[PDB]
Amino acid sequence: RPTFYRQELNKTIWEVPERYQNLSPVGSGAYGSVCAAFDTKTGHRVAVKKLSRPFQSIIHAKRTYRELRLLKHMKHENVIGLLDVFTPARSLEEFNDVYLVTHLMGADLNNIKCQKLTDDHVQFLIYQILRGLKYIHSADIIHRDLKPSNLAVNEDCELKILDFGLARVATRWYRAPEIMLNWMHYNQTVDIWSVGCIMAELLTGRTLFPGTDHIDQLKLILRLVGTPGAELLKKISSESARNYIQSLTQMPKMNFANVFIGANPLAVDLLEKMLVLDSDKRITAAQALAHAYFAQYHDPDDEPVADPYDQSFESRDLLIDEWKSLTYDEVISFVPPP
């Protein structure tokens, strides 16, 4: 084991190994906190995340295990992955803190180039999100909360997806209507909806469906895509949902060409295929990557899929000490990248 050093940051103590220097708080909240650090053993700059109260409850302990398993699994350029994972703990018995390490990214999509993002910037960014989603979706993982603050980018416009599979600017703004209005049954194209919303925003400078609550939000969405016809209305189980929607007079579906007016017509068509209510008819990430709007970036030989990922743990009901020991084991078996 390495040599650690302790230190208190933003009223947050940190006990990390010597290899990481110049810790400097970058972000925080409920989840825990993140510091930018310099990693002396490889010359690279990293982000160190200390989980907040990793084993305070069964739900905490399970989410901790969930995050570590997710992160150890993802190996892709457009998906945050694991450089290192460590604990001060010298034994299972002492184990109470988890720190996760990944390459440092510059900012998130809220605050990063132009005011007018430019259509080629748009192309590259959305291309990278779709390529990351492709990988993720291929492991039967779904983001569920995809949005600009979960998309990290570099000054070079390199992009990585953050916080995927954890939700087991405003979130509601980018959420697919089917999971928004509670649906246990949807598919991975919920994340494509969000992509749609993000893409629109970039191109346009304004949030596509702002919305002050779930009702205002759904109203804003039907205005653009139009009320569900009888074809889609057949797949809505709840009288509840079906009565409200059938309760509002039909809204026609708008001409996207006129909403996003003078955007690249290729952009608009793609927007048209992503922002469909029927989640059965919504384009998937692998299909979107083959749309013409990305002819300049698309490369079928370099848009890999994930190895199979075992989330059998997810239906497991265990005690905190079982989740905690599961997590400790994953720390101990961690193999850094080559």
Ligand SMILES: C[C@H](Nc1nccc(-c2c(-c3ccc(F)cc3)c(=O)n(C3CCNCC3)n2C)n1)c1ccccc1
């Ligand atoms: C400067 C900082 N750089 C950075 N780099 C890489 C990963 C990160 C990073 C991580 C993170 C850090 C280390 C890991 F091993 C895994 C993930 C993380 O969990 N977040 C937030 C995601 C939203 N939920 C709260 C935590 N961020 C921003 N941060 C940053 C701060 C804010 C936005 C984007 C980037």
